Amino acid sequence: LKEDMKMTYHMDGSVNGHYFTIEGEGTGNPFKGQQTLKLRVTKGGPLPFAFDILSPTFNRVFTDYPEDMPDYFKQSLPEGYSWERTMMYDDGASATASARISLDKNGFVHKSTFHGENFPANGPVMKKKGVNWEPSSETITASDGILKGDVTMFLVLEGGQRLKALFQTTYKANKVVKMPPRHKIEHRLVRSEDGETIQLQEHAVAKYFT
Numbered sequence: 001l002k003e004d005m006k007m008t009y010h011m012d013g014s015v016n017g018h019y020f021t022i023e024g025e026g027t028g029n030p031f032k033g034q035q036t037l038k039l040r041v042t043k044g045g046p047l048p049f050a051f052d053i054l055s056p057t058f059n060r061v062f063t064d065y066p067e068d069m070p071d072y073f074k075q076s077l078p079e080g081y082s083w084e085r086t087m088m089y090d091d092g093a094s095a096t097a098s099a100r101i102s103l104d105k106n107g108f109v110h111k112s113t114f115h116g117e118n119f120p121a122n123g124p125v126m127k128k129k130g131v132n133w134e135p136s137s138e139t140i141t142a143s144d145g146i147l148k149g150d151v152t153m154f155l156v157l158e159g160g161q162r163l164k165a166l167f168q169t170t171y172k173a174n175k176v177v178k179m180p181p182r183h184k185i186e187h188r189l190v191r192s193e194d195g196e197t198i199q200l201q202e203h204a205v206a207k208y209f210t
Contacts, residue, residue: 003032009025009037011023011057011112013113016119018047026110033062037198061074061076069206072173075178081173081174082171085167093116093120098113133187134153136151138169142179182209
């Protein structure tokens with residue numbers, strides 16, 4: 001595990017019954033909690049929905065942890081960890097996702113799935129009006145060898161509105177590691193697109209409360 005890591009991605013997903021596959025590569029500094037991803041829709045493109053609902057699916061190894069706080073995700077290496085997530089939007093839409101994070105010769109291997117339903121056909125998600133997620137603060141809590149994350153998310157939309165969603169995640173290392181206290185992770189995730197690709201950049205930093 002070094003300062004200059006590489007990643008690969010594969011997602012099989014669907015939204016409102018429209019199925020798609022996404023693949024890509026990434027680079028990042030896991031110790032500074034920084035990563036940059038380059039993704040392509042390899043099947044089912046172009047996506048008839050705002051890519052932002054998928055972007056948090058695309059790795060808490062890339063979190064800047066204080067030196068004296070147990071780092072659940074870096075401890076999980078080389079075997080890695082997996083997670084499962086529910087996402088409940090304020091308009092009644094809902095989605096689930098899961099991913100497995102592992103390592104090979106090249107670096108991190110990220111395999112994920114995504115299932116979303118009941119996004120209003122004429123709402124901002126299905127009309128591709130997302131801009132970016134607001135910076136967020138996810139509360140991490142520990143119990144029985146696993147972590148649970150809670151974060152209220154706000155998707156910035158065109159025209160100055162925001163769409164709220166509640167994210168809940170269970171992170172599983174699948175081997176015994178030293179467990180951290182209750183803490184928070186501050187995220188900043190931004191997206192850029194060019195017709196052929198999607199770029200994601202996340203900066204994530206873990207902090208103690210107060």
